[PDB]
Amino acid sequence: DEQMLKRRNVSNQGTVNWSVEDIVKGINSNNLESQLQATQAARKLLSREKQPPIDNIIRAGLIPKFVSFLGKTDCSPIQFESAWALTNIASGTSEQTKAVVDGGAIPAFISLLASPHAHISEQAVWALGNIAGDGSAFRDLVIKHGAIDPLLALLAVPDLSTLACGYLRNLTWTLSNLCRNKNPAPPLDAVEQILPTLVRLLHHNDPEVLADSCWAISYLTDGPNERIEMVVKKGVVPQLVKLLGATELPIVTPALRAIGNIVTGTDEQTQKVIDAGALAVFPSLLTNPKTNIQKEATWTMSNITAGRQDQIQQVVNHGLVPFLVGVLSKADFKTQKEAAWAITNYTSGGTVEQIVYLVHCGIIEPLMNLLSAKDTKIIQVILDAISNIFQAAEKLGETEKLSIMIEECGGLDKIEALQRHENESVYKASLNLIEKYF
Structure with missing residues (x-):
């Protein structure tokens, strides 16, 4: 019914309203910093309230570059910007989400779940949620790459209340997408694995966590x-x-x-x-x-x-x-x-x-x-x-x-x-x- 399938994140004035070709120019340069602003510019395009140029970005062949930036542990800022950009591309149609997956984003996003920067790991949680939300195949594919363990480890705390509100809601939402879809249904053992945490979230005091927990x-x-x-x-x-x-x-x-x-x-x-x-x-x-x-x-x-x-x-x-x-x-x-x-x-x-x-x-x-x-x-x-x-x-x-x-x-x-x-x-x-x- 009404649980959002995919969610776009729409939440340095030099990186505003860049042209896709300008973005390509920057990402193609051999300057990590030039690539960083170019990626932020791309993320801002994909974060605009009206009609993000998702196809233009895909067509420019930026996904592979973005997915590669995810592994740049030495430059967390670019990891974040590309994670956010990929997240939004993945929030689109099935063909668009496929583009992200085809670029090898899944293993890259699961690797970011253990990142020291909560805002980066949160984007990975968000992206994986969008990918799994596409359907059975991608959900099961996200599960095969071993996403459940890392996700559940993010909630492994004495009191869920010490976790950032927005962060908790994203994890809960993404987890619910791993329980979603019916033809086929989620792997039995994956459900068994998630249930205990889901049971814990059903007792949290936040209406949004409760709503999504119930959906799951x-x-x-x-x-x-x-x-x-x-x-x-x-x-x-x-x-x-x-x-x-x-x-x-x-x-x-x-x-x-x-x-x-x-x-x-x-x-x-x-x-x-x-x-x-x-x-x-x-x-x-x-x-x-x-x-x-x-x-x-x-x-x-x-x-x-x-x-x-x-x-x-x-x-x-x-x-x-x-x-x-x-x-x-x-x-x-x-x-x-x-x-x-x-x-x-x-x-x-x-x-x-x-x-x-x-x-x-x-x-x-x-x-x-x-x-x-x-x-x-x-x-x-x-x-x-x-x-x-x-x-x-x-x-x-x-x-x-x-x-x-x-x-x-x-x-x-x-x-x-x-x-x-x-x-x-x-x-x-x-x-x-x-x-x-x-």
Whole structure:
């Protein structure tokens, strides 16, 4: 969703607004100092707020020279300027990032991580973040060059608070990019290696470190139950639930994504978020003003009602059913569709006493009105729900009572209509429902 993939660093008046050809003239000279100003001039071009000349710089064949300056231990200033310049080139398109990698920048940047000058090592952290952020291949390539050890060694301190705020945020961000992307997913052992530190960052007091830490965890929980388990096993669920109640949307968003990912796992994994007290935060999430938080919360809900009956009960006890009736009644269409799933799921695995409660909460009408939507999949999900409900009524000899209810709110004058729907799964379902109850 919204975590920045790549980031450009846009943070000696003689080195201002130089011409690319002037920059080439200086870097090609055999004067370390002349090369230094030329590189700073290049970095300033790449740091300008509007349209950095990334392609012009690449075309001039400066990347190889810049990457070579990274190794000039004797002249730290040029190491910094070229690191910053390469960082910004790497923040561009895939082809541009490829140019940096093709120049042999990865091993050079990993070497700078251990630099005595924190501003230089920070630029290396930043650059590697941009490279890994390009995709799976480069992320795994950064991992193969041995970047994880050096990065994690930068956070190996008794108290993260003694570290410079900006510095910590860059490391956290870059680390999250090493956890990012899914096809393929990060090496298992690389994830295992990073998790402990990630777990430590999830407890830091900075909103930006927390936001990115949550994003990283959300990426790790996005996949097979085996992946979810390595995370859940670290005991972060309770902390994730806490961040779920945060004031800052940038924290709640990734935190709700992680929790939503976790509940797509086993019922045992789902039970962990329930035990953490996650449900108590949903009355807020399900009415949240930001439509995406609401949609994701309803999607998460739909995966919790897809669990055991005792888990569907927890949903009932927290008074969340009326909130689902609310989201089904009025909300962004995509959120409504998620509400429909949450319902159809609830009705497919809940007890009769539970499906009865669902109806007493007023689910029938809003469910009907939604049959008036042009999205054959939702109409299917809803029809599946009505059938799952009649089924429970049949067991109480209250099918008639339900038939009338659907009749009162115009439901039948919609199902009969659907009976004449071009899809076999729909005009079939309506038929059955009709001829069987109506």
